[PDB]
Amino acid sequence: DMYIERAGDITWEKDAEVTGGETTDGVYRVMTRRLLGSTQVGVGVMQEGVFHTMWHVTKGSALRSGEGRLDPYWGDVKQDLVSYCGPWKLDAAWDGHSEVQLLAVPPGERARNIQTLPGIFKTKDGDIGAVALDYPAGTAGSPILDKCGRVIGLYGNGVVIKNGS
């Protein structure tokens, strides 16, 4: 018994804090109900009728969105990703040198944007971008945005670089 709650629109804010059918487009909290209350297990992105979050957040469990239900469609544990009622839609990528915005949606708190420049973490599958910020447990899946409001990654999973593309 896990459910999602819409938290806001996915948009780049110009005055941002700086560092150095049934399911509407938006950013959602991923919640789970305990007898006593409920806990934010993560965050996800609704785009083109597909919900996107990270595997560790749901482990493929179904999600009820308002009145309806959402069923898992694609998932990969190695990548730690999962999409619901539709294949993966988030195709945007990071140029590899521009500042991004983390649309942080921490548990119990209002969503916010925060500009930052990812580090490039060198790994044996490719260079990848990493948002070097610390947010609570449950903030995972918060969207990472480019200047055009497009989702180039999700918090905690890296940002793909495609200048070499």
Side-chain angles (χ1 to χ4, degrees):
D1 179 36
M2 208 154 60
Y3 70 92
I4 70 172
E5 260 179 37
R6 198 171 185 288
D9 289 339
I10 315 258
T11 84
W12 177 287
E13 279 208 316
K14 278 115 282 259
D15 61 344
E17 229 212 53
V18 216
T19 336
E22 167 215 282
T23 60
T24 329
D25 283 24
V27 67
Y28 286 71
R29 296 165 181 285
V30 187
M31 306 303 293
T32 206
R33 187 73 66 175
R34 314 184 318 271
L35 212 218
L36 314 104
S38 52
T39 326
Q40 184 168 312
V41 193
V43 177
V45 179
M46 190 64 74
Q47 231 189 243
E48 317 193 19
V50 178
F51 190 60
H52 310 67
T53 190
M54 303 187 27
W55 180 272
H56 91 243
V57 176
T58 70
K59 310 227 153 187
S61 163
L63 306 172
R64 68 192 155 82
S65 168
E67 328 205 269
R69 209 260 285 267
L70 302 164
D71 285 286
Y73 185 93
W74 171 73
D76 184 84
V77 306
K78 276 251 189 174
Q79 310 162 58
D80 188 28
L81 293 169
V82 60
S83 68
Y84 282 78
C85 52
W88 194 262
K89 303 287 169 197
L90 306 170
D91 42 41
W94 178 48
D95 48 54
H97 58 284
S98 297
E99 305 211 315
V100 310
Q101 276 179 25
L102 174 46
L103 202 211
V105 184
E109 285 198 288
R110 210 167 207 77
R112 81 217 53 194
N113 297 69
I114 159 111
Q115 274 193 225
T116 164
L117 175 92
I120 94 177
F121 186 140
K122 201 168 131 64
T123 60
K124 293 179 173 173
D125 322 74
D127 280 333
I128 207 156
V131 176
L133 299 169
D134 173 65
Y135 277 90
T139 317
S142 278
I144 306 148
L145 270 35
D146 69 15
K147 308 210 181 201
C148 311
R150 274 146 37 197
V151 187
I152 47 167
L154 298 182
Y155 186 49
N157 212 67
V159 200
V160 148
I161 326 156
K162 272 179 67 180
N163 206 56
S165 102

